[PDB]
Amino acid sequence: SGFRKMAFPSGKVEGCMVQVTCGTTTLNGLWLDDVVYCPRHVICTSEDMLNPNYEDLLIRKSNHNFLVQAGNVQLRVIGHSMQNCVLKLKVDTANPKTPKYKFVRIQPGQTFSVLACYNGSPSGVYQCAMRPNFTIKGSFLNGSCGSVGFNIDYDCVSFCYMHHMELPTGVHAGTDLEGNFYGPFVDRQTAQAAGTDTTITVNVLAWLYAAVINGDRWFLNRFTTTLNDFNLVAMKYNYEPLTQDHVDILGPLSAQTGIAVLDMCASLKELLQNGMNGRTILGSALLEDEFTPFDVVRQCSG
Amino acid sequence: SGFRKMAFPSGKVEGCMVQVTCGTTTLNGLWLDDVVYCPRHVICTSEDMLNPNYEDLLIRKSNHNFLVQAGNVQLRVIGHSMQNCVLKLKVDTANPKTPKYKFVRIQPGQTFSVLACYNGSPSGVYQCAMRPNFTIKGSFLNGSCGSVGFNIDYDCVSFCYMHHMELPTGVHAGTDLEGNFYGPFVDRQTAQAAGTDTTITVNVLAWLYAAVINGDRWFLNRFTTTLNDFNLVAMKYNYEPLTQDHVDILGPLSAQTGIAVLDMCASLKELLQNGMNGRTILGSALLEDEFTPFDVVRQCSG
Ligand SMILES: *[C@H](O)[C@H](C[C@@H]1CCNC1=O)NC(=O)[C@H](CC(C)C)NC(=O)OCc1ccc2ccccc2c1
Numbered sequence: 001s002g003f004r005k006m007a008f009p010s011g012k013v014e015g016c017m018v019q020v021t022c023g024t025t026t027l028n029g030l031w032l033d034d035v036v037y038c039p040r041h042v043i044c045t046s047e048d049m050l051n052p053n054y055e056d057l058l059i060r061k062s063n064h065n066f067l068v069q070a071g072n073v074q075l076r077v078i079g080h081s082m083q084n085c086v087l088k089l090k091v092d093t094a095n096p097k098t099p100k101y102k103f104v105r106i107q108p109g110q111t112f113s114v115l116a117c118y119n120g121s122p123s124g125v126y127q128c129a130m131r132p133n134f135t136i137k138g139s140f141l142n143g144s145c146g147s148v149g150f151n152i153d154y155d156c157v158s159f160c161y162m163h164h165m166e167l168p169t170g171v172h173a174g175t176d177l178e179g180n181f182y183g184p185f186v187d188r189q190t191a192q193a194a195g196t197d198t199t200i201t202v203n204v205l206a207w208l209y210a211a212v213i214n215g216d217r218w219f220l221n222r223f224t225t226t227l228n229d230f231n232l233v234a235m236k237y238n239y240e241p242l243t244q245d246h247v248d249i250l251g252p253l254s255a256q257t258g259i260a261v262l263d264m265c266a267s268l269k270e271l272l273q274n275g276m277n278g279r280t281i282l283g284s285a286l287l288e289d290e291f292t293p294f295d296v297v298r299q300c301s302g
Numbered sequence: 303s304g305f306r307k308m309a310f311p312s313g314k315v316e317g318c319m320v321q322v323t324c325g326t327t328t329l330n331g332l333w334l335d336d337v338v339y340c341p342r343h344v345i346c347t348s349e350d351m352l353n354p355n356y357e358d359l360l361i362r363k364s365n366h367n368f369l370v371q372a373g374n375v376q377l378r379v380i381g382h383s384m385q386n387c388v389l390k391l392k393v394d395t396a397n398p399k400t401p402k403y404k405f406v407r408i409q410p411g412q413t414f415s416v417l418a419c420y421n422g423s424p425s426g427v428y429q430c431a432m433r434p435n436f437t438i439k440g441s442f443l444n445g446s447c448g449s450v451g452f453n454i455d456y457d458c459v460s461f462c463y464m465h466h467m468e469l470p471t472g473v474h475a476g477t478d479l480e481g482n483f484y485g486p487f488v489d490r491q492t493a494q495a496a497g498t499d500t501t502i503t504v505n506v507l508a509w510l511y512a513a514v515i516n517g518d519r520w521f522l523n524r525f526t527t528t529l530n531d532f533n534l535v536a537m538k539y540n541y542e543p544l545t546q547d548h549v550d551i552l553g554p555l556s557a558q559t560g561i562a563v564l565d566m567c568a569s570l571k572e573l574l575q576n577g578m579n580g581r582t583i584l585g586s587a588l589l590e591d592e593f594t595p596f597d598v599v600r601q602c603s604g
C-alpha cells in the first residue's frame with residue numbers, strides 16, 4: 001500500500017544523454033544510434049534570440065561548429081540537419097547503450113517522467129503532466145534544455161518531450177522528439193504566455209480511486225449523478241468535460257473498487273462544492289490531477 | 303524555476319538489482335561486487351513468520367537453497383551468511399556494473415530516493431523522508447522487499463535503506479544495509495505499530511525558502527521571533543524543536559533570500575496559527591516537510 005508520485009526508472013535514458021556545445025551555448029542532446037537530437041536554438045547567439053532565422057543560422061554552420069561530449073569521450077559530428085525545432089547531428093559512433101525506443105506525441109492530460117540534465121549529466125527524475133494548455137509544471141534551470149520526457153513500456157522507451165523554454169508564469173514548454181512544439185509556442189525569446197489552464201477531470205477521478213484503494217473513504221457518498229449534470233458542475237469549477245471514453249478508461253478502477261464512475265463523480269461534485277473541511281486525501285489538501293488512470297493501476301496492483 | 307519532488311537518477315542502482323528466491327518466497331537483492339544483500343526473512347515459511355528463529359532457519363539452509371537471477375543469467379551462490387536482519391549471499395561472479403558506493407545509516411528527517419522493484423526488476427523511483435518515528439511513507443506492494451533507498455553524491459551511491467515490511471497504518475519500515483532496523487521494529491509478522499509522528503521543522507523552513515526563491519511571498523511578514531518563543535509554538539503544533547545546528551544548516555538559504563532564519567520562523571508561526579485561508583505554497587495546501595535544506599539547494603541553484 002501507499003501512493004506516491006512515481007517516475008519510471010531512468011537508467012535507459014541516462015545512457016543516452018550527451019552535452020552539445022555550439023559557440024558559448026551548451027545544452028543537452030539525446031544520443032540514439034548514430035544521431036544526436038537537441039533543441040535547434042543551440043545555434044543561436046544572444047542577439048539572435050529575439051527573432052532568429054534558423055535556416056540562415058544553420059546554413060552558416062559547419063560540422064566542426066558542434067562539440068558533442070559523451071562523458072569524457074568527445075564525439076565527432078559528421079552531418080547536421082534541422083527538423084522543425086530540433087537539430088539532428090549525425091555522429092560517427094552509434095550509441096552502444098541505445099535502448100529500444102519510440103518517438104510519440106502525447107495528448108494533454110497524459111503524464112511522463114522527466115530526466116533533468118545539465119552539461120550532459122543527469123541531475124534528477126520527476127513526474128509531469130502535459131497540461132490542457134500545453135505547458136508542463138517542471139523544474140528547470142538554465143542549461144536544462146535538451147532534457148527529455150519519456151514513458152517506459154516493458155523494455156521500450158517512448159520519448160515524448162524535449163525541453164526548450166520557460167514561460168513568464170514559471171511553467172515550461174517544449175516539443176515532441178520530431179521538434180513540433182506542444183501548444184502554440186515558438187522557440188524565440190519573446191513575450192509568450194500560457195493560456196488559462198483547466199483541471200484534468202479524468203485524472204482527479206483516477207486519483208480518488210487510488211484513495212479508495214488505499215483506505216481513504218470519508219469523501220464517498222451514496223449519491224450517483226448523470227454525465228450531463230456532472231459536466232454542468234465541471235464547467236463551473238474549470239474542469240474538463242467528462243467523456244464516455246474517459247468513463248470507459250476508468251472501467252478497471254471502477255470494477256476493482258465496486259464504485260461506478262458516475263458514483264465517484266457525485267463525490268467529486270460534493271468535494272468541489274464544499275471543500276475538504278480540514279481533511280486530506282492521500283496526504284494532499286487539494287484535488288490532484290497529475291495521475292492518469294494508467295498511473296494508478298500501475299502503482300495500485302493490490 | 304519550478305520546484306518538484308525530485309529523485310536521483312536511478313541507473314547506477316538499477317544495474318545492481320537481482321531476484322532472490324528461497325522456497326516459495328521471492329524478493330529483491332542488491333548485487334555489489336560478488337555479494338548479494340537481501341532481507342533475511344526470505345528464508346522464512348508462512349508459519350515461521352509469527353516468531354522465527356533465524357539462526358536455526360539459516361543453519362538448515364544450503365547454498366543451493368538460494369536462487370539468484372540477474373536478468374536471465376542465473377547466478378551461482380557459493381556462500382551465505384547473516385548480519386543482523388540482512389542475508390549476504392556470496393556469488394561466483396562480481397557485478398560488472400557495481401558503482402562506487404557506501405553504506406550509510408541516516409538520521410530522521412533526511413531524505414533518499416527509493417527504487418521500487420519486483421522480481422529483480424525496477425518498477426519506479428520516488429523520494430522519501432525518514433520520519434521522526436523511523437517509518438517512511440512509501441509505496442510498496444508484496445514482492446517489493448529488498449528494494450533500496452539511496453542518495454547519490456558526485457558518482458558515489460550511498461545506500462541507506464532496504465525495505466522489509468508494512469505497518470498497520472500503511473507506512474513502511476526497514477533497515478540500513480548492514481541490516482539494523484530503523485526504529486524499534488523487528489522482522490516478524492506480529493502487531494507492531496508506528497509511534498506518534500512529528501513534523502520535521504527544519505525541512506518545513508527549507509521548503510518555505512524554496513517558495514521564496516520561486517516567487518511565493520504572500521506568507522512573509524515583517525516580524526522576527528526568538529528561538530525560545532518559536533519552540534513554544536512548535537511544541538503546541540507537534541513540530542520538532544528547532545536547534546542552533548538547524549539554524550546554521552539553513553544559512554545558505556537564508557543568505558540567498560536575505561531572510562534571517564528567525565524571520566522565516568515568524569512566518570511559519572503565523573501559518574500554523576492561521577492556516578492558509580485558501581492560498582497555496584508551491585502548489586500545496588499543506589506545509590511540506592520532506593525536503594531537506596540540501597534538497598532545496600540542489601534544485602534551487604538560481
Ligand atoms: C535552455 O536551456 C533554457 C531553459 C530555460 C532557462 C530557464 N529555465 C528554463 O527552462 N531555455 C531558454 O533559455 C530559452 C531560449 C529560447 C531561445 C526560447 N528562453 C527562455 O526560456 O527564456 C525565458 C527565461 C526565463 C528565466 C531564465 C533564467 C535564467 C536564464 C535564462 C532564462 C530564460
Ligand SMILES: *[C@H](O)[C@H](C[C@@H]1CCNC1=O)NC(=O)[C@H](CC(C)C)NC(=O)OCc1ccc2ccccc2c1
Nearest residue numbers: 001343351442443444445446447466467468489490491
Ligand atoms: C516483502 O516483500 C513484504 C513487503 C510488504 C508486503 C505488503 N507491503 C509491504 O511493504 N514484507 C512482508 O511481507 C513482511 C514479512 C516480514 C516477516 C515482516 N510482513 C508484512 O509486511 O506484513 C504486513 C503486510 C501488510 C499487507 C500485505 C499485503 C499483501 C501481502 C502481505 C502483506 C503484509
Ligand SMILES: [Mg+2]
Nearest residue numbers: 221223263266
Ligand atoms: Mg457517490
Ligand SMILES: [Mg+2]
Nearest residue numbers: 523525565568
Ligand atoms: Mg517574518
